[PDB]
Structures are given as C-alpha cells and as structure tokens.
Amino acid sequence: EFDYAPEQSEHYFFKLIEEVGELSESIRKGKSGQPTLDELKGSVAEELYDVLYYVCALANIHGVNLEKTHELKEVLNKVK
Amino acid sequence: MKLSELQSHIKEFDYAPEQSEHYFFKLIEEVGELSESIRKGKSGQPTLDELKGSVAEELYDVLYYVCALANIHGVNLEKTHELKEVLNKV
Amino acid sequence: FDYAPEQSEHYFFKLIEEVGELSESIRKGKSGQPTLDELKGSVAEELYDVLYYVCALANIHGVNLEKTHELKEVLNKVK
Amino acid sequence: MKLSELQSHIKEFDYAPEQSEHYFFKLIEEVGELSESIRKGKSGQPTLDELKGSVAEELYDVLYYVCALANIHGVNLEKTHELKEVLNKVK
Ligand SMILES: [Mg+2]
Ligand SMILES: [Mg+2]
Ligand SMILES: [Mg+2]
Ligand SMILES: [Mg+2]
C-alpha cells in the first residue's frame, strides 16, 4: 500500500494532524465517556483511538519499537 | 505492555480529572515536538543516549497524552479498539 | 464570552480543528486560489480559517500582532 | 501591515516551493509552541526581552507559516478573506 517510506510517513503524519483536529472538536463538544457502537462516531473515544492508530502507524514506518521506548522512558522516570 | 495496562499504569501515576485542559495542551505540545523530530529525520529505535528529541520519544509522548486524556474522559481504549474493529469490518 | 479563559480555550480548540482540516486539504492537494464555488475544503479556506483563530487568540490574549511583527522584524535583521 | 503586504514580504524572504513539507512541519511545530505559551499563561504584549516563548511570539510564528504556506500553495489570503466575507454576510 506504500513502497517509498517518506510518502508513507508524510501520509500518516497528515492523518495524525487530521485526527488531532477531530479530537479537538469532540473534546470541545464534551463528547466524553465510553460510547456504545451507535454512539462511537465523533466521540472523544473514537478520536483518541484514531490518534493512537496513526501514532502506531508512524512508529511502524519510522522503525520505532514503542514497547522498548516505554521501557527506556521508565528507566529515566525512575532516575528522576 | 497491553494497551489497557499502559492506560491503567498512566492513571496510577498521573490522574488529575479537574485539569483536562492541561492534558490537551500537553498533547498539542508533544504533537509539535513530534513534527520537529520527523522533519529532522530522527528515526529508528534509539539507545538511551539518543532518546531525547527522537521520533521514538515524541511518538511515545503523544501516546502518553492520548492515554492520559482517555483516563480523564472516561474512555476505555482497548474497548474502543474492539468497537472500531467491528465498524471497519463493515 | 465574558470569562477570558473560556474564550481562549474555545478559540484554541477551534484553531486545532482548523489545523486538522488544513492537513486534510493539503494532503488532498486542494491548492490554488478557488472561486466561490470551490472554496469549501480548499487549502485557501483552511489557511484563512487558521488565520482567523490566530487573530481571535491575539485579541483575547492582549496581543498586538502589528507590534509583534515590528519586534520580530528587528530581531530577524540581526540574523 | 496589510495581510497581502505581509504575505508578499514573507515570499521575498522565504519561498521554497519544492519544500512544501518543510513549511507544514514548521506550522505544526509552532502550533505546539503556541500550546505551551498558552498553558503557561504568557499573555499580553511583550517588550523585546519578554518576547521569547510569549503567546505573542508563538501567534506571530503560526501566522508566519500560514502566510508561507499560502505562498507555496498559490493562495491569496486577502482575496480568500474577501470571498469568506461575502459568504458570512449572506448567512
Ligand atoms: Mg476521526
Ligand atoms: Mg516530548
Ligand atoms: Mg475549516
Ligand atoms: Mg516559535
């Protein structure tokens, strides 16, 4: 679905910013809580999940292991 | 680390439900730092000395605030994921 | 709005919403200068919308963008 | 400073049409710095020694990239403003 890495990265980055925009709208409108299926569209829940999706997609393309990264952050957290 | 476990661990450490704007501001701050790390091409998986400013760090920091905001807003990300799995299959 | 923080928070949410819509417009390559009929969803419209909220935030935060420009102009001339 | 004059002055100084992503990354970087300045309450109109990290600086920096992107994408902001002004009075 993408061969040239920078175009894949650029696409997912545009999508991340689009979902952050939709997240801003959902939070502004107070669409909090845990929706059922019928309530999911435009909920804060859906938009947070959508941002997460693109964070994970960007990690994949950038060769980032989020679990290892978390591990390192925890090491520093404990120092501090 | 399971998603629900990360969300729960973040809640134990950092949960200020009366400070919802704090978390939103921080999310946008981290998204900006992420933009910088991508522009500068700081990709790959860093060792501890390379961590600061890396794409890896900034992605993790965005993730942290997504989870912290989920806790603030009464969202179960793992359950929301399950729900999204259903819709995207339609 | 009477209470300034709520005004600021509203405009900041709107700014982020418009930056998202801008990202979509650029991704889709909706460049150029639209006619009235092509305006909706154009890069032009989203840039203007982002600008609107920048100016709205300047107002609420007591920022003079003309004066700020003048100051930046100076510093830039040393770079 | 007219909006059209600001846009054209920025074009004179900084116009790299083959670097469209540069400008978009920078816009998002400035929006994040704006978020920080607002969270920290760095409001008002700063003097020169107060400028760095101020809400004023970050708002100007976002404005700069909005104008720079307009140049990149063939957008006339003043004309766009006029078109939006037309629609706003209608509804
Ligand atoms: Mg969405
Ligand atoms: Mg960071
Ligand atoms: Mg818009
Ligand atoms: Mg700045």
**Structure solved via:** X-ray
Give the type of residue at C36: L
Q: Which residues contact residue D16 at a Cβ distance below 8 angstroms, ignoring those fewer than 6 apart? A: D22
Rounded to the nearest 10 degrees, the angle between the axes of helix D77-90 and helix C43-60 is 80
CA atoms lying within 13 Å on the CB side of residue D51: 18
> Measured between alpha carbons, how far is C27 from A64 in angstroms, rounded to an integer?
24
Q: For residue B72, which of B30, B2, B14 has the smallest C-alpha distance?
A: B14
> Measured between alpha carbons, how far is C72 from A28 in angstroms, rounded to an integer?
33
Rounded to the nearest 10 degrees, the angle between the axes of helix B20-39 and helix D20-39 is 150
> Measured between alpha carbons, how far is D44 from D41 in angstroms, rounded to an integer?
9
Q: Which of B75, B77, B84, B85 to substitute to test the interface with A, most A CBs within 10 Å?
A: B75
Chains adjacent to C (≥3 CB pairs closer than 8 angstroms):
A, D
DSSP state of B50: G
- CA D71-D77-D80 angle, to 5 degrees, is 130
Burial of C13 (0-12, 13-18, 19+ CB in 10 A): buried
Instruction: Looking at the complex, report in whole angstroms how far the Cα of residue B61 sits from the nearest Cα belonging to chain D.
Output: 13
- What six digits make up the tokens of B16? 């200020």
Neighbours of ion ligand 2 (CB under 5 A): B 30, 33, 61
> Measured between alpha carbons, how far is A31 from A27 in angstroms, rounded to an integer?
6
Q: What does residue D59 show for φ and ψ, rounded to 5 degrees?
A: -60, -45
Cα separations in angstroms, A29 against A49, B18, B28, C4 = 17, 17, 18, 18
> Measured between alpha carbons, how far is D31 from C19 in angstroms, rounded to an integer?
9
* Domains of chain B from N-terminus onward: 1-90 (1.10.287.1080)
Q: Which residues contact residue D73 at a Cβ distance below 8 angstroms, ignoring those fewer than 6 apart? A: C26, C31, C32, C43, C44, C47, D20
Q: What is the DSSP string of chain C?
A: --SHHHHHHHHHHHHHHHHHHHHHHHHTT--S---GGG-TT-HHHHHHHHHHHHHHHHHHTT--HHHHHHHHHHHHHH-
Under 8 Å CB pairs connecting chains A and B tally to: 115
Instruction: Looking at the complex, report in whole angstroms how far the Cα of residue B86 sits from the nearest Cα belonging to chain A.
Output: 9
CA atoms lying within 13 Å on the CB side of residue C15: 29
Chain A residues with at least one Cβ partner in C under 8 Å: 11, 14-15, 17-25, 27-28
Q: What does residue D67 show for φ and ψ, rounded to 5 degrees?
A: -65, -40
